[PDB]
Design a protein around this ligand. Structure first.
Ligand SMILES: [Zn+2]
Ligand SMILES: [Zn+2]
Lengths: 153, 310, 310, 153, 310, 310
């Protein structure tokens, strides 16, 4: 939690905490998933001294807890990152990100001739884990690509 | 209510063997005894955003056969609104108010799926989305195949031509690998092989599919020779010529085939299927071609109608 | 005979408040109890000399709802005869023999009026003449407005957008300034003001119409927010951009509006009306959009039918 | 410059603390100028209690020093923000966002016929201040527009 | 090194006062003693992405009068690529490796501005760029007002027609304002109004202007009558009509205009200056055309050369 | 009489080794001391039956740099005749009675080959001819590999993109194979595979090549990186996608390529070489363009002349 060192450092109140977030994907989550848009005090810690685990990003989401659904959503951008529920200045629940079935509206069907590109619809793909390498099936065009492909978009 | 009542008919994958079998059973009944006022009073818009004349004259001929009224459009000549500017969303939204159902065809893939979202609760049936789906064909495909060997299992279906891109060999494969013991032989150019993912799901069932260089490499051991068209664009003309006759089926080649072997092909053929073939008893295309009127009727019947007391 | 029997439906100006009210009363009855064989045996040609697909699918969907047969054309692709050489006169003359009625749409203004001359004694209904008239819209406009506040008087109608050119804000204004106490606020670009002559006849009645720079300058005190589209052509793109969001209506802006305030707009919108608006309860466009099927039915019913014993 | 001594604010030895930003601007900044696009220790405190501005956005960044320039760009959004350049636990001195005469690569010419749109070229805006708004000329289509319209939504 | 040496003529503002005289000083010289070999071996690309035959001919004829070879084309839709991959940035970069001067025209504002940052060390002359600029035309117009009248400061310049979207007026007015004493009479329809910017600047520089109802009130007062084509396209057929009759110049109206009074127009005249005008010496729009051959000659001649006994 | 004198440059195979050097030797000379009067009085027909602005401009600019006049045109559908009677055989026979060199381009393979047997004693340069040849481009490419590297034998030439239908690759590979030591790395999608012919010959001549998964494995190994545009058109939107990401060259990848390593591309680049590439000295596709002005200059210069102090 607290990247303490030798001075006064601030913590939160009752919120979800995500650490050991592969450095550089915190902002992405922040942007992408859009948890940034709130009147609740957030605190972030990009590029942190994880010494052995190099660096990490970190999102101390105050007064807010994430549904184990959302938690899962992390997986491709911050899989090993932990989301600990901290109530009353303490980890009531250490939570780890599992892989879901469907990925809602943060992804982009690389299919140019799709319809999802031009319209008022929210991206949805089916995650079919294969030999621990992912394939993502667009719910519209019915084309299936890999995770690496749709992650460049 | 009948299983497919009020349902959406979008992708073949989305119909189970029990399903296909209902519509298959139904269309068949229909074939014999018509109900020319079954969908009377009902109105269906035809929305052929990418005009396919015969397919339209087919949905429309089915529409009129149960006495159903029809409104609609086709090949937006050039700049018809609901194209640029106007999103197909807002355009499904509006028709969903006037009409009792919607059959459409479209250039981009998934279009139908999307349509389903703003469709309201008015049935939509994809009749051509992108290089994705075209269920209705598949139905009149097996309604035809079943009509020739009273079974969708124990079959050795030959699927020649451009397997790779053709959007109907993949589904028909799909459909057929839902019934048992289906042996699929694949006659195709190196440059136009099957699209693997079809293969993998095929092996996943553990279905048989011996790849073939020539039709005479199966010619004897076959029932439904399904022949599709290869297209110029997707292959240099010299290469087109290179092969040309490599996959064209002549009637002489039919001196080998079984009694009940029937050659099918969605249409149109042109360079692929010769006319001597037209006359020989294995020619059935124009028959699968008129059969779809009944596979079409059915789908329309089961969807707009509650109980199918045929 | 019912007042509008055998009459011509050409210009809004040409219908009096008593009139509108009949068709308004009728369409409404129709809405509840259909008469799917009211105009049976009758045949109406659709003559969309300037294709407006939805408007056609609407007249046509109304046509088929009373079991009426339909013949016709649309967007003369290029050189269809009855264009150059052949005068629309001679062309109304001929159809006036085969058909029982005529609904048409046309590029030049007055076309319908002319049609009336050679129409013989076969009813014609303008469904789009030039930048002149488009009554049928107006009807489904107030059939919709009435359906939301059971009265065409005591109304504060907000009419945003390109007031100047839009051919539907002028008539709706006209129509509305035939019922009492109608307060009209005009949200518009300097470059696209009202067309005065509308104003003068408005002051001549002595009707209220406070001009407005922003929608939030009326936002609270409103019922029918009628929003039209502004068009690129009639305003330099930089100027288009200059304003752009000056008259686009967002749903956030709807945190101000009254309970029963409903936003209408002939369709299609695109840059003007946002989707959050689609979901909020004031969104009614697709509803005015399906309502016109009934305003449409009615007109067709009263004109081809003697006595409206609905 | 706020000392919540219950969850005291951590002090970075030197770098750049961008304190006093109205809410929802802080992150808007993270992207707009690309401040996360570094492997440095960055600190994002968002929606902070300051009686003088309700929620304040705050951006500490280790050992980085913005020139008189990046400061000046902030102008368009975070105008009350103060860049207090730090060094050795104390401030070397404060800095305020001087309004510039140009704004590159971050805006987009409102003009739908501005070539800048389909081409490999940064948006460049000449910026003159006037009466009740800032006006900015495109470097390409050449049209003047208000800041209110160019930097909207 | 003359000033205009190696400089891209992109827009009127980047040309100072001194600048324009050195352009006007040249052409007056080349109209007297022309240098047919002064740009030999020079190849010039004439790249008309937007089609403009009349400007193209003047531009290429101008090159030819000085010795350059010319290569070029008209319309991207009449080019090899565009939307099919090639970017502007890349075409210019390439072309910028053959020729010594790119003169281009464009459907978009800024292409010129941008090409100048791709062309490498090749100067780029703007034949057109959307609603934006058009240097040569204006550089010319001035040179024609300078020739006819003998001066560019202290004039009674009246502009007429579409002041609003008028790309050429906004260019001429800014250049004239670089000089002193001028007064500008503005006589255009209320809708096709001179935009506020020009105005605002007109008064930053504290320059005399004033709006007018017709040319009746100013006919004498004026020296130069820059005419401009109004547009039915800009208006509406019926709109166009009511005001068009307010802005046609008959020979009769020149009636009592000063002996020095001249009439200008960027051409194509088409309603405004009626044909009876041409016989009056006040007519000078063709004389104005033949001048751009010197207008443009001067530019090209200055851009690529350094010294000149001109 | 130099060798290439009066000879029609129809195709790469009829050019020996000595042949290409005498072409490469020339241009290197004309890039140093250019002869602006060396082809004066010469009129050349530039006959672009297929539209190719970029090749047209280079070709005509090349003529102009040597003194010839030029006359020509673009597209038969933009000519007087074609399908309407006139035959190729006859147009050439006629045209072959004005000009001294026909340079043409064509939608069909062989037009060049054929024109050479109609043109009479007029030499005929092939700007293009269907899937077939394209001499000048290649003659050029070599001259650009020779300049950048200093040699044409013993290279680490890697080709990338659409090797299959790639008209320019098949031409460059055959010419390089006329030289010794070269090795060819092939990195294209399994479908857009280098055709077998080239291969088969590649090994008749016992030349070193090998197929590769990406440019990762070869980035250093190579000296010259001839890039080529892949095609969604060749693939299918969804197909295109899965592999396109396998063949884009970022500046990052040049990462650790030899100091001499160069990147080539016939242009229009459009996805492959991303823009960050251009700032690296390894970028040389524009430098390659400016060279065809010498490539082609040499040809024309050799074809019509006999002696040269070149
Ligand atoms: Zn998709
Ligand atoms: Zn711009």
């Amino acid at each position: 939690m607290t990247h303490d060192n030798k001075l006064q450092v601030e913590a939160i109140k009752r919120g979800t905490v995500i650490a050991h977030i592969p450095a550089q994907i915190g902002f992405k989550l922040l942007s992408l998933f859009k948890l940034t848009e709130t009147d609740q005090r957030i605190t972030i810690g990009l590029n942190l001294p994880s010494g052995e685990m190099g660096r990490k990003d970190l999102i101390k989401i105050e007064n807010t807890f994430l549904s184990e659904d959302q938690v899962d959503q992390l997986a491709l951008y911050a899989p090993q990152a932990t989301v600990n529920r901290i109530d009353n200045y303490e980890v009531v629940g250490k939570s780890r990100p599992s892989l879901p079935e469907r990925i809602d509206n943060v992804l982009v069907c690389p299919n140019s001739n799709c319809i999802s590109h031009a319209e008022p619809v929210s991206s949805s793909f089916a995650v079919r884990k294969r030999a621990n390498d992912i394939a993502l099936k667009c719910k519209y065009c019915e084309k299936e690509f890999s995770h690496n492909v749709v992650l460049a978009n | 209510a009948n299983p497919l009542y009020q349902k959406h008919i979008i992708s073949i994958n989305d119909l189970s063997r029990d399903d296909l079998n209902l519509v298959l059973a139904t269309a068949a009944k229909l074939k014999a005894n018509p109900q020319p006022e079954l969908l009377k009073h009902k109105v269906i818009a035809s929305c052929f955003f990418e005009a396919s004349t015969r397919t339209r004259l087919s949905f429309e001929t089915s529409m009129h056969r149960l006495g159903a009224s029809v409104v609609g459009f086709s090949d937006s000549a050039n700049t018809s609104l609901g194209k640029k500017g106007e999103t197909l969303a807002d355009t499904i939204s509006v028709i969903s108010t006037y009409v009792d159902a919607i059959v459409m065809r479209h250039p981009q893939e998934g279009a139908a799926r999307l349509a389903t979202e703003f469709s309201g609760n008015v049935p939509v049936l994809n009749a051509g989305d992108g290089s994705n789906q075209h269920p209705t064909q598949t139905l009149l495909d097996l309604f035809t195949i079943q009509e020739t060997q009273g079974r969708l299992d124990n079959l050795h279906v030959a699927m020649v031509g451009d397997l790779k891109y053709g959007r109907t060999v993949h589904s028909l494969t799909q459909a057929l690998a839902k019934f048992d013991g289906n042996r699929f032989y694949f006659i195709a150019p190196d440059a136009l092989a099957m699209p693997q993912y079809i293969l993998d799901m095929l092996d996943e069932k553990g279905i048989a599919w011996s790849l073939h260089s020539s039709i005479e490499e199966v010619m004897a051991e076959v029932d439904i020779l399904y022949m599709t068209r290869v297209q110029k664009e997707r292959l240099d003309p010299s290469e087109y010529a290179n092969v040309k006759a490599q996959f064209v089926l002549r009637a002489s080649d039919l001196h080998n085939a079984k009694a009940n072997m029937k050659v099918l092909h969605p249409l149109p053929r042109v360079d692929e299927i010769a006319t001597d073939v037209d006359k020989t008893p294995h020619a059935w295309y124009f028959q699968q071609a008129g059969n779809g009127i009944f596979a079409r009727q059915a789908l329309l019947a089961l969807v707009l109608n509650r109980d199918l007391v045929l």
